[PDB]
Design a protein around this ligand. Structure first.
Ligand SMILES: CCCC[C@H]1CN(c2cccc(OC(F)(F)F)c2)C(=O)CN1Cc1cncn1Cc1ccc(F)cc1
Ligand SMILES: CC(C)=CCC/C(C)=C/CC/C(C)=C/COP(=O)(O)OP(=O)(O)O
Ligand SMILES: O=S(=O)(O)C[C@H](O)CNC1CCCCC1
Ligand SMILES: O=S(=O)(O)C[C@H](O)CNC1CCCCC1
Ligand SMILES: O=S(=O)(O)C[C@H](O)CNC1CCCCC1
Ligand SMILES: [Zn+2]
Lengths: 318, 488
């Protein structure tokens, strides 16, 4: 049974301060007794700018009830730094919050601030934790953005070794093996292979990358993630579309991977993004009428949800 | 008007093919296809002259949705505590939805809205998610509070606009405290950095006449570098230093409808600003391509997904659908700079809203993510905002902007903001007044094109017209921004 804080000897010196939104506010929330009581005393604590262990305990009680309470998270981080608290202990507490399904922009940002301030010489154990944490939701947007930040921040400090980058690509390849439709993992591959400042750009790496892309398409011909990655790849490096057309043409009915001689089952043709590739390759050949004919078929037959967009592309050919 | 916007009921519905390669993504996609297609099969085609006997009628249940929103003006159950730091969003979702639905609040209730929000305003600058004695200011509640005051306030002594005007300098100082050298903003003291903050800040700074050069420096570069290889935009970009002038910027996650909306809208607001070589360009063609590729197939009802290989969801009607006119205008400017059918299926999006996103009839009302999900204030607001964009053909009109320039009175205005750094303001009055004229004239440049209306299911489904970029009615935007620029 609940003991109000006015009855606790540890809080007897503190006069709580009521929430002030006026006499008849709109969108009022029917707070539990526990939540109102804690915020009443938090208002008093924040008003007197008290930095103490009891204030720290109070912030944890509050964010457990409302993990999105950015003001209380802000106060909690200033408590940790003012008291010189163990930031590694706080990281373990955050691991529990994720386990108990306490999550928000605010918890993820709190974790970032901890890693920034700890500034480990090697962030490998945090990288591995993030990998494991993707098990209940392999597309968690906050988690993927945080992983990008972690590698970017600690690479600026010079603390990501070549072996670490190599095992990160190994892990990414396994994520896409388990689900080739995970667009978050495709985005991570782009960082690892293309956009990060330390990435290699050579004749071999471009060949390797195109092989991986084309193999992925031949495994899942209708996977939009692989088509977008292919188009982004060619555009980013200013590579022509025509030399690759042999691998794409079978979906529109050299040594780079080709489609299976019988295509896999459940692969109805044509693949609309294959047609888009063909049209754009026609445009690359200045064959605007051939491109316009392909756009017209996308508009009226093969991708009718986008009939207007493909008609717009058709008209541009004139 | 509908030759290139085929109805979902007129197209063959087929599942996303498997290529004989099962995965967790495809499991969820197929289950969602079953959910949505079954509800369409039970619902009469909204395009029929006589609604079919035995099937559900898809008409917009405006009175049910009004009653769903009404709890906002009484109280919310204790489970809403998860939104205790987002109460201005609860206001905005409610009062903008009521505007769209055509339902007026009486003056006493509007005054309560105004008074509640002014209790969230800190003297040192900005609105928080709740009372200023409880929560610190935050860029996102600041947008929601400012837009809500545009919807519910007025120019009298109790109307709240007078209070906002007096807060202009402090709000500006809050914005400059949030500013990072690379062009990002923290959303609050010690808070995260992403394009939601940039969007919310630029909307408010545009509306209140508090834009300066020091506020905007590098903001265009931060946003441009959020664009991904897919053509949409991520939450943020990372500045790598040389060893305010990074060697390069790299996007930090996937293209997402919410961040693509914020980035396109931010970039569009910056194109009004007369600074040299500003804003840094984006790839508008790729953003338009990404936008249209997110509209789902007939089997999933023609709603929008928020990112590649995820599920359709009614709230992306606003985030992705509402970005379409912005991307269109940027593409048009690029084409013009080098020297019409709808760009997304305006009919199918309405069908998703009417058939799949409304709560089942005779119930709580409200609109929702998908069948099987409880409705909430957020999906109610964003479903209806996207529905408005689909019903009304919106474009940014150069002749309207020109007419606005011709009527602008630069000798009227509130006091210039005082920059935090000595040389952080405009160079002189000629340049400041030219900036005010361009920013005001372009903010008021969106029009509904006559004869472009498409109301699926009949005129009783029509809702009011929202504005791209701001997401408030034009009849709210015009007197509000005119108040702060002293125009009439
Ligand atoms: C009534 C509950 C609403 C929950 C919803 C919105 N939501 C929010 C809460 C407070 C303010 C605000 O601001 C703004 F974005 F403008 F609406 C948003 C969240 O945190 C979570 N959401 C979950 C969701 C539902 N469908 C797609 N998502 C993903 C998502 C994620 C983040 C986001 F920010 C917007 C959407
Ligand atoms: C003005 C303002 C605050 C704009 C923000 C708009 C917005 C929708 C942002 C989305 C952010 C996000 C992390 C979505 C992923 O959530 P999810 O994984 O639950 O949903 P998903 O599967 O649809 O991607
Ligand atoms: O679905 S809505 O349009 O929002 C409102 C509901 O239909 C209410 N139906 C009433 C039944 C009895 C006669 C008066 C109407
Ligand atoms: O005078 S101002 O700085 O504008 C307004 C005061 O700072 C109030 N800030 C709150 C105090 C209690 C905790 C949450 C913030
Ligand atoms: O204005 S029109 O588009 O020609 C037709 C009307 O809007 C039809 N609205 C229905 C009338 C009967 C009750 C359910 C709604
Ligand atoms: Zn949603």
């Amino acid at each position: 049974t609940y003991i109000p804080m006015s009855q606790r000897r540890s809080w007897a010196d503190v006069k709580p301060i009521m929430q002030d939104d006026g006499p008849n506010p709109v969108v009022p929330i029917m707070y539990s007794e526990e939540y109102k009581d804690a915020m009443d005393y938090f208002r008093a604590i924040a008003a007197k700018e008290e930095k103490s262990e009891r204030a720290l305990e109070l912030t944890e009680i509050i964010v457990r009830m409302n993990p999105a309470h950015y003001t209380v998270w802000q106060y909690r981080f200033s408590l940790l730094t003012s008291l010189n608290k163990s930031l590694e202990d706080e990281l373990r507490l955050m691991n529990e919050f994720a386990v108990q399904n306490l999550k928000s922009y605010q918890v993820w940002h709190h974790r970032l601030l901890l890693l920034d301030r700890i500034s480990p010489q090697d962030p490998v154990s945090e990288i591995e934790y993030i990998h494991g944490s993707l098990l209940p939701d392999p597309k968690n947007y906050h988690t993927w953005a945080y992983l990008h930040w972690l590698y970017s921040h600690f690479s600026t400090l010079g603390r990501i070794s070549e072996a670490q980058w190599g095992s990160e690509l190994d892990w990414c390849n396994e994520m896409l093996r388990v689900d080739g439709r995970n667009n978050s993992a495709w985005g991570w591959r782009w960082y690892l292979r293309v956009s990060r400042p330390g990435a290699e750009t050579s004749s071999r790496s471009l060949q390797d990358e195109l092989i991986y892309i084309l193999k992925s398409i031949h495994l899942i011909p209708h996977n939009v993630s692989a088509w977008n990655y292919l188009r982004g790849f060619l555009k980013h490096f200013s590579l022509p579309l025509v030399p690759i057309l042999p691998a794409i043409l079978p979906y529109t009915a050299f040594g780079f991977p080709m489609p299976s001689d019988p295509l896999p089952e459940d692969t109805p043709l044509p693949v609309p993004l294959a047609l888009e590739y063909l049209a754009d390759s026609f445009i690359e050949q200045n064959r605007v009428d051939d491109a316009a004919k392909v756009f017209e078929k996308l508009s009226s037959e093969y991708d009718q949800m986008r009939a207007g967009y493909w008609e717009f592309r058709r008209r541009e050919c004139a | 008007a509908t030759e290139f916007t085929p109805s979902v009921y007129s197209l063959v519905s087929k599942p996303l093919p498997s290529n004989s390669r099962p995965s967790a993504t495809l499991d969820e996609q197929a289950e969602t296809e079953d959910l949505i297609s079954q509800l369409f099969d039970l619902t009469a085609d909204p395009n029929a002259l006589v609604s079919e006997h035995g099937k559900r009628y898809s008409g917009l249940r405006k009175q049910e949705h009004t009653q769903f929103l009404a709890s906002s003006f009484f109280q919310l159950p204790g489970k809403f505590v998860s939104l205790d730091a987002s109460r201005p969003w609860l206001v905005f979702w409610t009062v903008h939805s009521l505007d769209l639905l055509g339902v007026a609040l009486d003056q006493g209730t509007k005054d309560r809205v105004v008074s509640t929000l002014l209790h969230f305003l800190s003297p040192k600058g900005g609105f928080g998610g709740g009372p200023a004695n409880s929560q610190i200011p935050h860029l996102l509640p600041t947008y929601a509070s400012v837009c809500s005051l545009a919807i519910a306030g007025n120019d009298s002594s109790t109307g709240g606009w007078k209070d906002l005007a007096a807060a202009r300098q402090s709000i500006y100082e809050f914005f400059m405290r949030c500013k990072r050298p690379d062009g990002g903003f923290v959303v609050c003291e010690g808070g995260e950095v992403d394009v939601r903050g940039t969007y919310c800040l630029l909307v408010v700074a545009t509306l209140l006449d508090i834009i300066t050069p020091e506020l905007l420096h590098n903001v265009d570069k931060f946003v441009s570098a959020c664009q991904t290889y897919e053509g949409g935009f991520a939450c943020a970009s990372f500045p790598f230093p040389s060893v305010s002038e990074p060697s390069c910027r790299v996007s930090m996650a996937e293209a997402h409808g919410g961040y693509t909306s914020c980035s396109l809208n931010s970039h569009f607001l910056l194109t009004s600003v007369p600074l040299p070589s500003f804003p840094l360009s984006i790839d508008a063609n790729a953003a338009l391509r990404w936008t249209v590729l997110q509209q789902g197939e007939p089997i999933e009802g023609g709603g929008f997904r928020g990112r590649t290989n995820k599920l359709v969801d009614g709230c992306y009607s606003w985030w992705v659908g509402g970005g379409a006119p912005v991307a269109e205008e940027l593409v048009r400017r690029e084409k013009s700079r080098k020297v019409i059918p709808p760009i997304f299926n305006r009919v199918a999006l309405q069908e998703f809203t009417l058939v799949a996103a409304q709560q089942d009839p005779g119930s709580t009302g409200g609109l929702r993510d998908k069948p099987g999900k409880r409705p909430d204030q957020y999906h109610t607001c964003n479903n209806l905002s996207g529905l408005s964009i689909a019903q009304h053909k919106m474009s940014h009109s150069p002749s309207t902007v020109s007419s606005n320039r011709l009527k602008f009175d630069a000798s009227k205005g509130l006091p210039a903001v005082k920059p935090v750094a000595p040389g952080g303001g405009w160079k002189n009055e000629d340049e400041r007044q030219n900036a005010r004229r361009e920013i005001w004239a372009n903010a008021l440049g969106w029009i509904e094109e006559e004869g472009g209306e498409i109301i699926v299911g009949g005129k009783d489904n029509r809702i009011n017209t929202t504005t791209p970029v701001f997401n408030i009615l034009g009849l709210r935007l015009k007197p509000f921004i005119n108040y702060f620029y002293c125009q009439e």
